[PDB]
Amino acid sequence: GSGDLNLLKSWNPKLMKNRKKVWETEQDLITEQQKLNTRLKEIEKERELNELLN
Amino acid sequence: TTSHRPQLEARSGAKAAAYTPTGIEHARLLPGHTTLKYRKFSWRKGTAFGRHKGYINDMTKSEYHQEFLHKHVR
Amino acid sequence: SRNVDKANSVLVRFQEQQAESAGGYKDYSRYQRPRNVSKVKSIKEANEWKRQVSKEIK
Amino acid sequence: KISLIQIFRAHLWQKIHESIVFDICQILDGELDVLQIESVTKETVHPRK
Amino acid sequence: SERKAINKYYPPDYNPLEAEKLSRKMAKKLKTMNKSHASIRLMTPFSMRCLECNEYIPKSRKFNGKKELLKEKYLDSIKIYRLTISCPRCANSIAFRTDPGNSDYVMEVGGVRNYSIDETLQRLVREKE
RNA sequence: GUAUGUCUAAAGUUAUGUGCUCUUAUUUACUAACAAAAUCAACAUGCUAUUGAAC
RNA sequence: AGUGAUCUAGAAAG
RNA sequence: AAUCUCUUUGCCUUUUGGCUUAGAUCAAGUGUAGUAUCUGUUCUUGUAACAAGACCUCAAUGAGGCUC
Ligand SMILES: [Mg+2]
Ligand SMILES: [Mg+2]
Ligand SMILES: [Zn+2]
């Protein structure tokens, strides 16, 4: 036994299980944020249309 | 390195002789062999090269070692 | 695992509780010392906390 | 051993037993007059039961 | 008893539920249940240099270190931990913390390595683009 | 194969100068001595090309 | 046209 | 308290203390096998009349004093 001890530690961010956890959390937040930015562009366009009307 | 040392002198058996046995029954010291014995008192022309034209006291160079290497390394 | 999370297992803690109930035994070094002294009423247990402070300053 | 105590962690066996006992008692209560029952008593059973 | 013992002895009066409730009342007063860090064995994840005494610490050196869960979380979801060792020559505390977003580590105190959630969400969206 | 080491509780003084209540692991989860020599199961059934203002 | 021939079995420490 | 110092020789005077697969490796989406615990809500009436430590003696020192 001569390998990296930290591959058996739960807290090690290098581990693929931790990378997977981080990545899935990030995907949830990213999809929510993409939806948010789409609708916020719609708010910006609505403002522009009201200013064009006035 | 200082834990890892050669043997300068061996432990003397005189130390073990200085105190008595402590009564542990070892299996190999149980009775056994309890009685002593005592004595009585044409086609072969077409080729360029045809005929038509031990012991030593070194283990490593002995023929057995050469044969062993040719057998077990391949 | 180590000595610490073995000693803080449920069985050990329950045995500590049962021992302080059934025979009054309590290794005070396990337990956090009272910040305010006046909440302690027994002379015996106050002196034992005093002993804890003594070994701490040593 | 590790896998099965991981499944039955935090006293799930006793929880299953208590919940099923309560479910049978609580539905027998809803049929007390139907089955002519004077009383339904959930018993104070020993924890290892 | 062996390492892999199946059964432990419970006294005949032992109720597990009451025992856990009593041990929970006890746990709030025990010293070693309430101290702020967990001791661990870990390897040095990268080559680092102590700042007090300039000692070089190579990667993959084993240490006895202290683990702290921090209050802050990466994107308010993922646990960040500080990992604290002490310098082998001069015993000064060296600390570093996990960096989950980079899947990496970042230095904190006592040493140097050799060689914002809204903004993070925006950066992640641009990265996905 | 879940290291290990030191410390202390000592003794007072050895004679002179009970509540409530969450829980579909919501755990700060811990240990690495252990093993590492991985390839049968792959893969679709036939290959692509495009637009400049003005004198 | 059918006769038979029947190994095993788990614990500790490292 | 009776000499002291330098060079060159001789003495080495802090003058490398075992073994094996150079012991192995420069390294792994790790796998595998054990031992634990949860986490968290959350708390204990006014006015009037009437009444009331020192010293001494015995001696393991405490009881007594129109005492203060
Ligand atoms: Mg070993
Ligand atoms: Mg060993
Ligand atoms: Zn240093």
Swiss-Prot record, chain D:
Disulfide bonds: none annotated. Changing H46S: No effect on viability. It is found in: Nucleus. Present with 468 molecules/cell in log phase SD medium. Functions as a scaffold that mediates the ordered assembly of spliceosomal proteins and snRNAs. Required for association of BRR2 with the spliceosomal U5 snRNP, and the subsequent assembly of the U4/U6-U5 tri-snRNP complex. Functions as a scaffold that positions spliceosomal U2, U5 and U6 snRNAs at splice sites on pre-mRNA substrates, so that splicing can occur. Interacts with both the 5' and the 3' splice site, as well as the branch region. Has a role in branch site-3' splice site selection. Associates with the branch site-3' splice 3'-exon region. Also has a role in cell cycle. Component of the U4/U6-U5 tri-snRNP complex composed of the U4, U6 and U5 snRNAs and at least PRP3, PRP4, PRP6, PRP8, PRP18, PRP31, PRP38, SNU13, SNU23, SNU66, SNU114, SPP381, SMB1, SMD1, SMD2, SMD3, SMX2, SMX3, LSM2, LSM3, LSM4, LSM5, LSM6, LSM7, LSM8, BRR2 and DIB1. The MPN (JAB/Mov34) domain has structural similarity with deubiquitinating enzymes, but lacks the residues that would bind the catalytic metal ion. Contains a region with structural similarity to reverse transcriptase, presenting the classical thumb, fingers and palm architecture, but lacks enzyme activity, since the essential metal-binding residues are not conserved. This is Pre-mRNA-splicing factor 8. The lineage of its organism: Eukaryota, Fungi, Dikarya, Ascomycota, Saccharomycotina. The gene is PRP8. The chain holds residues 1642 to 1690 of 2413 of the full protein.
